[PDB]
Point group: C3
Chain length 174, copies 3
Protein backbone atom coordinates (compact mmCIF):
# COMPACT_ATOMS: atom_id res chain seq x y z
CA UNK A 1 0.00 0.00 0.00
CA UNK A 2 1.24 3.46 -0.92
CA UNK A 3 0.22 7.02 -1.76
CA UNK A 4 -0.26 7.91 -5.45
CA UNK A 5 -0.65 11.53 -4.33
CA UNK A 6 2.91 11.34 -2.98
CA UNK A 7 4.20 9.85 -6.24
CA UNK A 8 2.48 12.83 -7.87
CA UNK A 9 4.03 15.36 -5.48
CA UNK A 10 7.44 13.75 -6.03
CA UNK A 11 7.14 13.99 -9.82
CA UNK A 12 6.22 17.65 -9.34
CA UNK A 13 9.64 18.12 -7.75
CA UNK A 14 11.49 16.37 -10.58
CA UNK A 15 10.25 18.63 -13.39
CA UNK A 16 11.03 21.68 -11.25
CA UNK A 17 14.58 20.35 -10.99
CA UNK A 18 14.72 19.41 -14.68
CA UNK A 19 13.52 22.93 -15.52
CA UNK A 20 16.10 24.36 -13.10
CA UNK A 21 18.83 22.14 -14.55
CA UNK A 22 18.04 23.19 -18.12
CA UNK A 23 18.06 26.83 -17.00
CA UNK A 24 21.52 26.49 -15.45
CA UNK A 25 22.91 24.69 -18.51
CA UNK A 26 21.37 27.23 -20.89
CA UNK A 27 22.53 30.42 -19.16
CA UNK A 28 26.09 29.05 -19.06
CA UNK A 29 26.53 27.40 -22.47
CA UNK A 30 27.17 23.89 -21.14
CA UNK A 31 26.11 21.40 -23.81
CA UNK A 32 26.94 18.41 -21.60
CA UNK A 33 24.76 19.89 -18.85
CA UNK A 34 21.85 20.27 -21.28
CA UNK A 35 22.04 16.53 -21.93
CA UNK A 36 21.86 15.66 -18.22
CA UNK A 37 18.87 17.99 -17.83
CA UNK A 38 17.16 16.56 -20.91
CA UNK A 39 17.67 13.02 -19.62
CA UNK A 40 15.92 13.94 -16.37
CA UNK A 41 12.95 15.45 -18.20
CA UNK A 42 12.74 12.33 -20.37
CA UNK A 43 12.31 10.20 -17.23
CA UNK A 44 9.44 12.29 -15.88
CA UNK A 45 7.59 12.26 -19.20
CA UNK A 46 7.88 8.47 -19.20
CA UNK A 47 7.03 8.46 -15.49
CA UNK A 48 4.07 10.82 -16.01
CA UNK A 49 2.77 8.73 -18.91
CA UNK A 50 2.80 5.60 -16.74
CA UNK A 51 1.04 7.20 -13.77
CA UNK A 52 -1.65 8.77 -15.96
CA UNK A 53 -2.05 5.42 -17.73
CA UNK A 54 -2.41 3.50 -14.47
CA UNK A 55 -4.65 6.09 -12.79
CA UNK A 56 -7.00 5.89 -15.78
CA UNK A 57 -7.37 2.12 -15.39
CA UNK A 58 -8.48 2.44 -11.75
CA UNK A 59 -10.93 5.26 -12.49
CA UNK A 60 -9.32 8.13 -10.54
CA UNK A 61 -9.29 10.77 -13.27
CA UNK A 62 -8.18 13.55 -10.91
CA UNK A 63 -4.78 11.87 -10.60
CA UNK A 64 -4.85 11.37 -14.38
CA UNK A 65 -5.22 15.11 -14.99
CA UNK A 66 -2.50 16.03 -12.48
CA UNK A 67 -0.24 13.43 -14.10
CA UNK A 68 -0.94 14.90 -17.54
CA UNK A 69 0.02 18.34 -16.20
CA UNK A 70 3.47 17.02 -15.26
CA UNK A 71 3.66 15.44 -18.72
CA UNK A 72 2.93 18.87 -20.21
CA UNK A 73 5.56 20.66 -18.11
CA UNK A 74 8.15 18.02 -19.02
CA UNK A 75 7.25 18.47 -22.69
CA UNK A 76 7.93 22.20 -22.29
CA UNK A 77 11.36 21.56 -20.76
CA UNK A 78 12.29 19.09 -23.50
CA UNK A 79 10.96 21.52 -26.12
CA UNK A 80 13.14 24.47 -25.15
CA UNK A 81 16.13 22.16 -24.68
CA UNK A 82 15.65 20.94 -28.25
CA UNK A 83 15.34 24.52 -29.54
CA UNK A 84 18.49 25.97 -27.95
CA UNK A 85 20.28 23.00 -29.50
CA UNK A 86 18.85 22.70 -33.02
CA UNK A 87 17.28 19.28 -32.45
CA UNK A 88 14.01 19.11 -34.39
CA UNK A 89 13.58 15.41 -33.51
CA UNK A 90 12.82 16.22 -29.87
CA UNK A 91 10.47 19.09 -30.78
CA UNK A 92 8.37 16.52 -32.65
CA UNK A 93 8.29 14.20 -29.63
CA UNK A 94 7.68 17.20 -27.37
CA UNK A 95 4.75 18.41 -29.48
CA UNK A 96 3.20 14.94 -29.65
CA UNK A 97 3.49 14.64 -25.86
CA UNK A 98 1.65 17.92 -25.24
CA UNK A 99 -0.90 17.05 -27.93
CA UNK A 100 -1.62 13.67 -26.34
CA UNK A 101 -2.10 15.31 -22.95
CA UNK A 102 -4.37 17.88 -24.60
CA UNK A 103 -6.31 15.06 -26.26
CA UNK A 104 -6.81 13.15 -23.00
CA UNK A 105 -7.61 16.30 -21.01
CA UNK A 106 -10.44 17.02 -23.45
CA UNK A 107 -11.79 13.46 -23.16
CA UNK A 108 -12.20 13.75 -19.39
CA UNK A 109 -13.56 17.28 -19.76
CA UNK A 110 -16.05 16.19 -22.43
CA UNK A 111 -17.27 13.22 -20.39
CA UNK A 112 -17.39 15.17 -17.12
CA UNK A 113 -19.60 17.76 -18.83
CA UNK A 114 -21.86 14.95 -20.07
CA UNK A 115 -22.29 13.53 -16.55
CA UNK A 116 -22.73 16.86 -14.79
CA UNK A 117 -19.49 16.32 -12.83
CA UNK A 118 -18.77 20.03 -12.57
CA UNK A 119 -15.57 19.67 -10.53
CA UNK A 120 -13.90 17.15 -12.86
CA UNK A 121 -14.72 19.32 -15.88
CA UNK A 122 -13.27 22.53 -14.42
CA UNK A 123 -10.15 20.68 -13.25
CA UNK A 124 -9.78 19.08 -16.68
CA UNK A 125 -10.53 22.40 -18.40
CA UNK A 126 -7.68 23.92 -16.37
CA UNK A 127 -5.29 21.32 -17.80
CA UNK A 128 -6.47 21.98 -21.36
CA UNK A 129 -5.20 25.54 -20.86
CA UNK A 130 -1.78 24.30 -19.73
CA UNK A 131 -1.49 21.84 -22.62
CA UNK A 132 -2.85 24.33 -25.17
CA UNK A 133 -0.49 27.11 -24.07
CA UNK A 134 2.43 24.72 -24.57
CA UNK A 135 1.19 23.28 -27.88
CA UNK A 136 0.96 26.80 -29.30
CA UNK A 137 4.47 27.73 -28.14
CA UNK A 138 5.92 24.47 -29.46
CA UNK A 139 4.07 24.74 -32.78
CA UNK A 140 5.33 28.33 -33.06
CA UNK A 141 8.96 27.16 -32.95
CA UNK A 142 8.04 24.41 -35.44
CA UNK A 143 5.90 26.28 -37.98
CA UNK A 144 2.90 23.95 -37.66
CA UNK A 145 -0.23 25.99 -38.34
CA UNK A 146 -2.62 23.08 -37.72
CA UNK A 147 -1.48 22.36 -34.16
CA UNK A 148 -1.31 26.11 -33.54
CA UNK A 149 -4.96 26.30 -34.60
CA UNK A 150 -5.56 23.18 -32.50
CA UNK A 151 -4.11 24.98 -29.47
CA UNK A 152 -6.32 27.98 -30.27
CA UNK A 153 -9.51 25.91 -30.53
CA UNK A 154 -8.75 23.95 -27.35
CA UNK A 155 -8.40 27.19 -25.38
CA UNK A 156 -11.83 28.31 -26.59
CA UNK A 157 -13.35 25.03 -25.40
CA UNK A 158 -11.71 25.75 -22.05
CA UNK A 159 -13.38 29.17 -22.02
CA UNK A 160 -16.80 28.12 -23.34
CA UNK A 161 -17.31 24.96 -21.28
CA UNK A 162 -16.23 26.86 -18.17
CA UNK A 163 -18.67 29.67 -19.00
CA UNK A 164 -21.51 27.13 -19.13
CA UNK A 165 -20.75 25.98 -15.58
CA UNK A 166 -20.54 29.60 -14.40
CA UNK A 167 -24.01 30.45 -15.71
CA UNK A 168 -25.21 26.97 -14.68
CA UNK A 169 -24.05 27.50 -11.07
CA UNK A 170 -25.55 30.99 -10.73
CA UNK A 171 -27.86 31.82 -7.82
CA UNK A 172 -31.48 30.67 -7.89
CA UNK A 173 -33.18 33.81 -9.19
CA UNK A 174 -30.30 36.21 -9.84
Amino acid sequence: EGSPRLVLRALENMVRAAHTLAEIARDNGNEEWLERAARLAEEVARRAEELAREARKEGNLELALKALQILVNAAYVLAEIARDRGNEELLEKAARLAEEAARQAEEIARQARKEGNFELALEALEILNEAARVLARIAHHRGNQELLEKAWRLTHRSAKWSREIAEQARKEGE
Copy 2:
Protein backbone atom coordinates in the same frame (compact mmCIF):
# COMPACT_ATOMS: atom_id res chain seq x y z
CA GLU B 1 -29.45 28.00 -4.67
CA GLY B 2 -26.08 28.14 -6.41
CA SER B 3 -22.43 27.25 -5.97
CA PRO B 4 -20.14 30.32 -5.87
CA ARG B 5 -17.19 27.93 -5.60
CA LEU B 6 -18.07 26.60 -9.05
CA VAL B 7 -18.64 30.09 -10.45
CA LEU B 8 -15.19 31.14 -9.23
CA ARG B 9 -13.23 28.20 -10.65
CA ALA B 10 -15.19 28.66 -13.87
CA LEU B 11 -14.28 32.36 -13.97
CA GLU B 12 -10.66 31.47 -13.17
CA ASN B 13 -10.48 29.10 -16.14
CA MET B 14 -11.91 31.87 -18.31
CA VAL B 15 -9.18 34.39 -17.49
CA ARG B 16 -6.51 31.73 -17.98
CA ALA B 17 -8.04 31.08 -21.40
CA ALA B 18 -8.06 34.79 -22.29
CA HIS B 19 -4.45 35.05 -21.10
CA THR B 20 -3.53 32.13 -23.36
CA LEU B 21 -5.41 33.52 -26.38
CA ALA B 22 -3.66 36.88 -26.01
CA GLU B 23 -0.29 35.10 -25.91
CA ILE B 24 -1.12 32.86 -28.88
CA ALA B 25 -2.34 35.85 -30.89
CA ARG B 26 0.59 38.04 -29.85
CA ASP B 27 3.34 35.52 -30.64
CA ASN B 28 1.76 34.86 -34.05
CA GLY B 29 0.77 38.39 -35.11
CA ASN B 30 -2.93 37.71 -35.73
CA GLU B 31 -4.77 40.98 -35.11
CA GLU B 32 -8.15 39.30 -35.61
CA TRP B 33 -7.26 36.86 -32.83
CA LEU B 34 -6.33 39.78 -30.57
CA GLU B 35 -9.91 41.03 -30.91
CA ARG B 36 -11.30 37.67 -29.80
CA ALA B 37 -8.93 37.59 -26.82
CA ALA B 38 -9.84 41.11 -25.69
CA ARG B 39 -13.56 40.41 -26.12
CA LEU B 40 -13.38 37.46 -23.72
CA ALA B 41 -11.27 39.32 -21.14
CA GLU B 42 -13.73 42.23 -21.11
CA GLU B 43 -16.50 39.67 -20.66
CA VAL B 44 -14.94 38.12 -17.56
CA ALA B 45 -14.45 41.64 -16.21
CA ARG B 46 -18.24 41.98 -16.17
CA ARG B 47 -18.77 38.63 -14.45
CA ALA B 48 -16.06 39.29 -11.86
CA GLU B 49 -17.37 42.79 -11.11
CA GLU B 50 -20.94 41.48 -10.96
CA LEU B 51 -20.17 38.63 -8.55
CA ALA B 52 -17.97 40.92 -6.43
CA ARG B 53 -20.93 43.29 -6.08
CA GLU B 54 -23.32 40.43 -5.29
CA ALA B 55 -20.90 38.77 -2.86
CA ARG B 56 -20.51 41.95 -0.80
CA LYS B 57 -24.25 42.66 -0.65
CA GLU B 58 -24.33 39.35 1.25
CA GLY B 59 -21.26 40.22 3.33
CA ASN B 60 -19.32 37.27 1.86
CA LEU B 61 -16.04 39.17 1.71
CA GLU B 62 -13.82 36.17 0.94
CA LEU B 63 -15.79 35.45 -2.24
CA ALA B 64 -15.65 39.19 -2.96
CA LEU B 65 -11.86 39.49 -2.74
CA LYS B 66 -11.48 36.34 -4.85
CA ALA B 67 -13.69 38.02 -7.45
CA LEU B 68 -11.66 41.24 -7.28
CA GLN B 69 -8.46 39.40 -8.24
CA ILE B 70 -10.26 37.95 -11.27
CA LEU B 71 -10.82 41.59 -12.22
CA VAL B 72 -7.11 42.36 -11.81
CA ASN B 73 -6.25 39.30 -13.90
CA ALA B 74 -8.82 40.23 -16.55
CA ALA B 75 -7.72 43.88 -16.44
CA TYR B 76 -4.07 42.87 -16.87
CA VAL B 77 -4.82 40.81 -19.99
CA LEU B 78 -6.71 43.74 -21.54
CA ALA B 79 -3.81 46.07 -20.75
CA GLU B 80 -1.32 43.81 -22.54
CA ILE B 81 -3.57 43.67 -25.62
CA ALA B 82 -3.97 47.46 -25.72
CA ARG B 83 -0.15 47.57 -25.58
CA ASP B 84 0.05 45.61 -28.84
CA ARG B 85 -2.77 46.98 -31.01
CA GLY B 86 -1.91 50.60 -30.13
CA ASN B 87 -5.43 50.77 -28.70
CA GLU B 88 -5.55 53.77 -26.36
CA GLU B 89 -9.25 53.30 -25.55
CA LEU B 90 -8.55 49.99 -23.79
CA LEU B 91 -5.63 51.26 -21.68
CA GLU B 92 -8.11 53.69 -20.15
CA LYS B 93 -10.66 50.90 -19.75
CA ALA B 94 -8.05 48.50 -18.33
CA ALA B 95 -6.72 51.00 -15.78
CA ARG B 96 -10.20 51.91 -14.51
CA LEU B 97 -10.87 48.22 -13.86
CA ALA B 98 -7.70 47.85 -11.79
CA GLU B 99 -8.43 51.14 -10.01
CA GLU B 100 -11.85 49.75 -9.11
CA ALA B 101 -10.34 46.53 -7.77
CA ALA B 102 -7.78 48.47 -5.72
CA ARG B 103 -10.66 50.66 -4.51
CA GLN B 104 -12.83 47.85 -3.17
CA ALA B 105 -9.86 45.82 -1.90
CA GLU B 106 -8.71 48.68 0.34
CA GLU B 107 -12.20 49.29 1.74
CA ILE B 108 -12.60 45.64 2.74
CA ALA B 109 -9.14 45.77 4.33
CA ARG B 110 -10.07 48.87 6.34
CA GLN B 111 -13.32 47.37 7.63
CA ALA B 112 -11.69 44.02 8.44
CA ARG B 113 -8.81 45.85 10.13
CA LYS B 114 -11.28 47.82 12.26
CA GLU B 115 -13.12 44.58 13.15
CA GLY B 116 -9.99 42.63 14.11
CA ASN B 117 -10.49 40.14 11.25
CA PHE B 118 -6.81 40.16 10.35
CA GLU B 119 -6.78 37.06 8.12
CA LEU B 120 -9.29 38.71 5.79
CA ALA B 121 -7.45 42.04 5.95
CA LEU B 122 -4.18 40.45 4.82
CA GLU B 123 -6.00 38.71 1.97
CA ALA B 124 -7.43 42.06 0.85
CA LEU B 125 -4.02 43.76 1.01
CA GLU B 126 -2.70 41.10 -1.38
CA ILE B 127 -5.01 42.47 -4.07
CA LEU B 128 -3.64 46.00 -3.75
CA ASN B 129 -0.33 44.48 -4.84
CA GLU B 130 -2.08 42.72 -7.73
CA ALA B 131 -3.93 45.87 -8.80
CA ALA B 132 -0.94 48.18 -8.36
CA ARG B 133 1.20 45.80 -10.42
CA VAL B 134 -1.18 46.37 -13.34
CA LEU B 135 -1.42 50.15 -12.87
CA ALA B 136 2.38 50.34 -12.68
CA ARG B 137 2.76 48.38 -15.92
CA ILE B 138 0.05 50.53 -17.52
CA ALA B 139 1.64 53.77 -16.28
CA HIS B 140 4.93 52.68 -17.84
CA HIS B 141 3.37 51.72 -21.19
CA ARG B 142 1.70 55.15 -21.44
CA GLY B 143 4.31 57.38 -19.77
CA ASN B 144 2.00 58.59 -16.99
CA GLN B 145 3.95 59.49 -13.85
CA GLU B 146 0.83 60.32 -11.84
CA LEU B 147 -0.30 56.69 -12.11
CA LEU B 148 3.14 55.38 -11.13
CA GLU B 149 2.87 57.33 -7.87
CA LYS B 150 -0.56 55.75 -7.43
CA ALA B 151 0.74 52.22 -7.98
CA TRP B 152 3.79 52.97 -5.82
CA ARG B 153 1.60 54.42 -3.06
CA LEU B 154 -0.78 51.45 -3.24
CA THR B 155 2.01 48.86 -3.28
CA HIS B 156 3.58 50.70 -0.33
CA ARG B 157 0.22 50.62 1.47
CA SER B 158 0.09 46.82 1.20
CA ALA B 159 3.47 46.47 2.91
CA LYS B 160 2.82 49.15 5.55
CA TRP B 161 -0.52 47.75 6.72
CA SER B 162 0.74 44.15 6.54
CA ARG B 163 3.65 44.92 8.87
CA GLU B 164 1.21 46.60 11.26
CA ILE B 165 -0.89 43.43 11.39
CA ALA B 166 2.24 41.28 11.72
CA GLU B 167 3.44 43.12 14.84
CA GLN B 168 -0.12 43.09 16.21
CA ALA B 169 0.22 39.28 16.25
CA ARG B 170 3.69 39.24 17.84
Copy 3:
Protein backbone atom coordinates in the same frame (compact mmCIF):
# COMPACT_ATOMS: atom_id res chain seq x y z
CA SER C 1 -0.59 33.70 15.89
CA PRO C 2 2.44 32.80 13.76
CA ARG C 3 0.23 31.84 10.82
CA LEU C 4 -0.84 35.49 10.74
CA VAL C 5 2.73 36.78 11.04
CA LEU C 6 3.64 34.42 8.19
CA ARG C 7 0.75 35.56 5.99
CA ALA C 8 1.73 39.20 6.50
CA LEU C 9 5.33 38.43 5.53
CA GLU C 10 4.27 36.77 2.27
CA ASN C 11 2.53 40.07 1.50
CA MET C 12 5.62 42.23 1.96
CA VAL C 13 7.76 40.12 -0.39
CA ARG C 14 5.09 40.55 -3.05
CA ALA C 15 5.24 44.26 -2.23
CA ALA C 16 9.05 44.38 -2.26
CA HIS C 17 8.98 42.56 -5.61
CA THR C 18 6.52 45.05 -7.12
CA LEU C 19 8.36 48.15 -5.90
CA ALA C 20 11.58 46.86 -7.45
CA GLU C 21 9.72 46.31 -10.72
CA ILE C 22 8.33 49.85 -10.59
CA ALA C 23 11.79 51.21 -9.77
CA ARG C 24 13.70 49.14 -12.34
CA ASP C 25 11.30 49.68 -15.25
CA ASN C 26 11.31 53.43 -14.47
CA GLY C 27 14.95 53.87 -13.40
CA ASN C 28 14.31 55.55 -10.04
CA GLU C 29 17.40 54.97 -7.90
CA GLU C 30 15.77 56.26 -4.71
CA TRP C 31 12.99 53.69 -5.16
CA LEU C 32 15.38 50.77 -5.73
CA GLU C 33 17.13 51.30 -2.40
CA ARG C 34 13.65 51.61 -0.88
CA ALA C 35 12.71 48.20 -2.29
CA ALA C 36 15.96 46.55 -1.17
CA ARG C 37 15.54 47.55 2.48
CA LEU C 38 12.05 46.05 2.42
CA ALA C 39 13.33 42.82 0.86
CA GLU C 40 16.19 42.42 3.34
CA GLU C 41 13.78 43.32 6.16
CA VAL C 42 11.42 40.44 5.39
CA ALA C 43 14.36 38.06 4.98
CA ARG C 44 15.54 38.93 8.49
CA ARG C 45 11.96 38.70 9.79
CA ALA C 46 11.41 35.36 8.05
CA GLU C 47 14.73 34.08 9.41
CA GLU C 48 13.49 34.67 12.96
CA LEU C 49 10.07 33.10 12.34
CA ALA C 50 11.67 29.95 10.90
CA ARG C 51 13.80 29.16 13.95
CA GLU C 52 10.93 30.11 16.26
CA ALA C 53 8.67 27.60 14.54
CA ARG C 54 11.38 24.94 14.24
CA LYS C 55 12.35 25.05 17.93
CA GLU C 56 8.58 24.67 18.51
CA GLY C 57 8.34 21.58 16.29
CA ASN C 58 6.08 23.19 13.67
CA LEU C 59 8.04 22.28 10.55
CA GLU C 60 5.33 23.19 8.04
CA LEU C 61 5.51 26.81 9.22
CA ALA C 62 9.31 26.77 9.12
CA LEU C 63 9.36 25.79 5.44
CA LYS C 64 6.89 28.49 4.41
CA ALA C 65 9.08 30.95 6.31
CA LEU C 66 12.01 29.58 4.29
CA GLN C 67 10.30 30.19 0.94
CA ILE C 68 9.75 33.83 1.95
CA LEU C 69 13.49 33.90 2.68
CA VAL C 70 14.19 32.51 -0.80
CA ASN C 71 11.81 34.97 -2.44
CA ALA C 72 13.46 37.89 -0.64
CA ALA C 73 16.85 36.51 -1.66
CA TYR C 74 15.62 36.51 -5.27
CA VAL C 75 14.37 40.10 -5.02
CA LEU C 76 17.71 41.36 -3.71
CA ALA C 77 19.65 39.33 -6.29
CA GLU C 78 17.65 40.77 -9.20
CA ILE C 79 18.18 44.28 -7.82
CA ALA C 80 21.93 43.73 -7.43
CA ARG C 81 22.35 42.51 -11.02
CA ASP C 82 20.53 45.50 -12.56
CA ARG C 83 22.56 47.89 -10.37
CA GLY C 84 25.97 46.16 -10.44
CA ASN C 85 26.23 46.14 -6.63
CA GLU C 86 28.59 43.37 -5.53
CA GLU C 87 27.85 43.88 -1.84
CA LEU C 88 24.14 43.16 -2.42
CA LEU C 89 24.90 39.96 -4.33
CA GLU C 90 26.73 38.80 -1.20
CA LYS C 91 23.68 39.40 0.99
CA ALA C 92 21.47 37.56 -1.50
CA ALA C 93 23.97 34.69 -1.52
CA ARG C 94 23.80 34.33 2.27
CA LEU C 95 20.00 34.28 2.33
CA ALA C 96 19.69 31.60 -0.35
CA GLU C 97 22.56 29.63 1.21
CA GLU C 98 20.86 29.71 4.61
CA ALA C 99 17.56 28.57 3.10
CA ALA C 100 19.38 25.82 1.20
CA ARG C 101 20.81 24.37 4.42
CA GLN C 102 17.63 24.47 6.50
CA ALA C 103 15.59 23.10 3.59
CA GLU C 104 18.08 20.23 3.38
CA GLU C 105 18.24 19.76 7.16
CA ILE C 106 14.46 19.66 7.63
CA ALA C 107 14.28 17.33 4.63
CA ARG C 108 16.71 14.94 6.34
CA GLN C 109 14.80 15.00 9.64
CA ALA C 110 11.34 14.55 8.12
CA ARG C 111 12.67 11.86 5.78
CA LYS C 112 14.24 9.83 8.58
CA GLU C 113 10.95 10.30 10.47
CA GLY C 114 8.90 8.94 7.55
CA ASN C 115 7.06 12.21 6.87
CA PHE C 116 7.40 12.13 3.09
CA GLU C 117 5.14 15.16 2.57
CA LEU C 118 7.44 17.50 4.51
CA ALA C 119 10.43 15.94 2.72
CA LEU C 120 9.04 16.94 -0.68
CA GLU C 121 7.96 20.33 0.68
CA ALA C 122 11.53 20.91 1.88
CA LEU C 123 13.02 19.56 -1.36
CA GLU C 124 11.01 22.05 -3.44
CA ILE C 125 12.57 24.92 -1.48
CA LEU C 126 15.97 23.46 -2.43
CA ASN C 127 15.08 24.12 -6.07
CA GLU C 128 13.98 27.62 -5.07
CA ALA C 129 17.26 28.29 -3.27
CA ALA C 130 19.54 26.56 -5.78
CA ARG C 131 17.87 28.42 -8.66
CA VAL C 132 18.64 31.73 -6.94
CA LEU C 133 22.23 30.73 -6.13
CA ALA C 134 22.68 29.69 -9.76
CA ARG C 135 21.74 33.13 -11.10
CA ILE C 136 23.90 34.82 -8.46
CA ALA C 137 26.89 32.65 -9.39
CA HIS C 138 26.32 33.57 -13.05
CA HIS C 139 26.11 37.36 -12.57
CA ARG C 140 29.12 37.10 -10.24
CA GLY C 141 31.51 34.83 -12.16
CA ASN C 142 31.84 32.15 -9.48
CA GLN C 143 32.08 28.66 -10.97
CA GLU C 144 32.22 26.87 -7.60
CA LEU C 145 28.95 28.37 -6.33
CA LEU C 146 27.44 27.59 -9.73
CA GLU C 147 28.62 24.00 -9.33
CA LYS C 148 27.19 24.05 -5.80
CA ALA C 149 23.73 25.13 -6.97
CA TRP C 150 23.89 22.40 -9.62
CA ARG C 151 24.38 19.62 -7.08
CA LEU C 152 21.66 21.17 -4.92
CA THR C 153 19.12 20.92 -7.74
CA HIS C 154 20.11 17.32 -8.48
CA ARG C 155 19.62 16.46 -4.80
CA SER C 156 16.07 17.80 -5.06
CA ALA C 157 15.49 15.47 -8.01
CA LYS C 158 17.39 12.45 -6.68
CA TRP C 159 15.82 12.54 -3.22
CA SER C 160 12.35 13.05 -4.72
CA ARG C 161 12.75 10.03 -7.00
CA GLU C 162 13.56 7.82 -4.01
CA ILE C 163 10.42 9.01 -2.23
CA ALA C 164 8.59 8.42 -5.51
CA GLU C 165 9.68 4.77 -5.34
CA GLN C 166 9.03 4.56 -1.59
CA ALA C 167 5.39 5.59 -2.13
CA ARG C 168 4.22 3.51 -5.10
CA LYS C 169 1.69 0.71 -4.83
CA GLU C 170 2.94 -2.87 -4.47
CA GLY C 171 1.92 -4.10 -7.90
